[PDB]
Design a protein around this ligand. Sequence first.
Ligand SMILES: CC(=O)N[C@@H](CCCN)C(=O)O
Ligand SMILES: CC(=O)N[C@@H](CCCN)C(=O)O
Ligand SMILES: CC(=O)N[C@@H](CCCN)C(=O)O
Lengths: 332, 332, 332
Amino acid sequence: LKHFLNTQDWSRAELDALLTQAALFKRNKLGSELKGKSIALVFFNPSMRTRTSFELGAFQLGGHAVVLQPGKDAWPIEFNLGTVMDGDTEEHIAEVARVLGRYVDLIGVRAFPKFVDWSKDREDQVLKSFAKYSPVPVINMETITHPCQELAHALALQEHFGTPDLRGKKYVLTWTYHPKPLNTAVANSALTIATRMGMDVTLLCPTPDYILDERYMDWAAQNVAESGGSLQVSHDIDSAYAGADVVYAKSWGALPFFGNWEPEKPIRDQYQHFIVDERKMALTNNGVFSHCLPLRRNVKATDAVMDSPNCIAIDEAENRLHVQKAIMAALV
Amino acid sequence: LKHFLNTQDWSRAELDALLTQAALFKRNKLGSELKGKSIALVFFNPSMRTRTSFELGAFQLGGHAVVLQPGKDAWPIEFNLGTVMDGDTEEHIAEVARVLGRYVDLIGVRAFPKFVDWSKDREDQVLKSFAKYSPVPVINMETITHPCQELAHALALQEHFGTPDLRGKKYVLTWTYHPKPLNTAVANSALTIATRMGMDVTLLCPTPDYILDERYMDWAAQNVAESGGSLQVSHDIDSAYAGADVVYAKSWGALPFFGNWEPEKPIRDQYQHFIVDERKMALTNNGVFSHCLPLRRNVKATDAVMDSPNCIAIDEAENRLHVQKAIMAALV
Amino acid sequence: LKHFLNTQDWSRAELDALLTQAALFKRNKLGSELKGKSIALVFFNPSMRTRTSFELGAFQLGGHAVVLQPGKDAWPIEFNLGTVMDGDTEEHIAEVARVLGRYVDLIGVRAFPKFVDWSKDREDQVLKSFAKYSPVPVINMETITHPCQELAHALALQEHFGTPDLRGKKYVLTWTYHPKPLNTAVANSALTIATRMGMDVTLLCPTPDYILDERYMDWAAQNVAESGGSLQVSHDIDSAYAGADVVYAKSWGALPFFGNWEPEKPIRDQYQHFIVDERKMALTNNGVFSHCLPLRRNVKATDAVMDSPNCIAIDEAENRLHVQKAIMAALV
Ligand SMILES: CC(=O)N[C@@H](CCCN)C(=O)O
Ligand SMILES: CC(=O)N[C@@H](CCCN)C(=O)O
Ligand SMILES: CC(=O)N[C@@H](CCCN)C(=O)O
């Protein structure tokens, strides 16, 4: 059975096919690729943009999405094995996935890390459990990676540059400020897709403590070796932005501080200057800027940058609809 | 771009067209006016009747409604301008509306006042912000006015009297008791539509403190001058009910007491006798009674009045479905 | 007007027709039996499996389900009669049902007992009120009985044995352990349908305190007299399981302890050995095992029993979809 858990699991040819199908759906949004079919959108964490895009995507192709929210509509689910369920959990994931598989044709899963222990969050237990027990294809709607965002982002860039071939372009994945420590998911995904596309990627962050998990740094390294781009880590803003063709910002909590965020606060507060502003973008090669959203204005990026004609965040946002339709259509 | 924010913004001819289209949908509810189209129902405050009627209305015309609840599915949204978003708000309304506009064809918005400061609530910030930033038509699902209720009410009255011409009929908008101070929205709307229809309207309330906002009193005055009816405020129950053809009740908190409801409590408790009962209706010209619902029995109106053959509240309730379909069809 | 409140209200011929229609829908799931029709799924208590199955069932037959959750989307509803609604309740059930009846073609209701007083919970007030005031058919989505589960269960058994005639088969409805006292609904329903099908039923429970309400014990007695089976209560595990063809487990709080669960805790904790394990099933006649779900593994039943090829719980779960479609189609 084929699932859409990560772009890294798919071949370049398969990804290219998805992006092209996404482009086709953008030119003709109504169809019957999902006629009479259904997808269960399982939200362990809520998301209006994800619910909206998937729900409409199913509708437009003749299918139907069922929105489920485990944290609000049911007792906790047990994912561990060989336990005596005499605690808080009422049902095991094996039963949840097997039953859903008798009702729907696809299962989408969104489940964020708990931020107490990265060794546990990085195992992607919720998503992997659904993939293990489900008799139908599973789709990652964001856990510790955000593959749907990757393709929406990739498509937006190809559309902006007028070509699917982005090799050679200088790509800057920059950490930006936020009052709280966030999920590294979007950054892990950006690094992954940018290198898979063969761009010359620079991971710009305040200190070595903010470097992403080795797993993704390795995915990126492997992608560069295969696509012909490059991977570099930098803690210097000006040299990173210089000549950049693309600047993608995202804030995230330093991994070494999981379960110990108190001391991480004064650290991030020293880098509020990582905010994407006009000065920094002026250093780029008339590059574009984007963010996965939601974005705190004048904190992650200034109003001037956000409303600049070079900001493609709304186009990338729209593309979530098109790429997800391509993903669902491919899996059924 | 045309929106449905208030009936006052539409011409009499346009409103008449909406009501007539509503009558047509009532005679033939299934159609394709919204085939493949969608509407995002954004609830900042929940409403089962509104979600049900809009959702079914979209379905019956071949479209699809996406139900969103910002207060429960996402962090707070920022509506103010030029601020540094380092507080509770995670995303700005500009981004929320622009992205939704790339997904749906229509956006419905329900957002109640906060009851702390009327000078702030009366600005209709949430609704006006959506209207400002959305690239698609916006529909008021109740904020400080309830235009959808206005048309459902107007249609019910025309159906009851067997004519679209209600000029001359004596219309009594009466305040009624409730243990808590409520939104003036429905009353503002009733006054607006009743006068727009040229009826002889009387605003019956306990004291001058309960008179509606000047904005609506002026809308009403303007409507009478143009339609040929009349507007009058009264604090005397018997003279108001005398000869009435229509009695519409609604409870609301005295505007001068926003952010200071403690002293307003003993005041409203002195007017529990404003309850619509048989004695009062016996003074009318065999007039009809209605309420927007939900209604507390034997508090706002007695069981006898509510179950009287002259109570058309259920018919007005049904009409929410028909008028909203007319509104959505007109805006796409 | 015909409703689906309990299987006991339907004739054997009618039930047989429902089960056969369910079998037909399983062979051809897409249809137009509900084309343009709708059902309001009213959840006073949430259920992902019920929302999913009903919602998809409506969709597959050309209809649409509207999901409503009174406890989270509105103030409390008043069910009592002749009261002055100056308390917590904002709207009366008469208005709720009458209005919904102007919007939808069917109304599903799920409302659990409150566990404080069984004399009150056993009156099925919420469901009976909807049935009384609704102008459209009402469907029990679980209150103090679970008729939809009954038919899904009945169908699974017929499919397992390869025949609709289960007379003579030894049916064991066994209480099982759970750390908390639960609803007797599923057990009441199992006893009801098993006897209606003419099986030789044994109600296995720890003590006389766990015997089900007299109402259902009488339904069962009447069913046996008419179908030709038998009804027996047992507190001895081994004699009950011996030669059993079917074992259906369910945990429930002892009725005599409603509103006084403290002393019931040490009592149930003495019967953890009621867990369905391999030893017990080894005593049966190669019988099947099932549970309505959700099931706590290694508490209600061991992993070995749950994953045994003789466990049909997932098939019974799937059948909720098919039988509910048969029910909705029959009522419209
Ligand atoms: C603010 C926040 O927690 N953002 C989320 C979601 C981003 C995609 N919509 C994150 O950091 O992954
Ligand atoms: C009780 C209450 O707050 N009623 C609301 C909603 C009325 C329309 N359904 C109000 O006063 O506007
Ligand atoms: C654990 C619990 O409360 N179970 C519920 C629902 C069973 C049907 N899904 C009950 O005892 O009725």
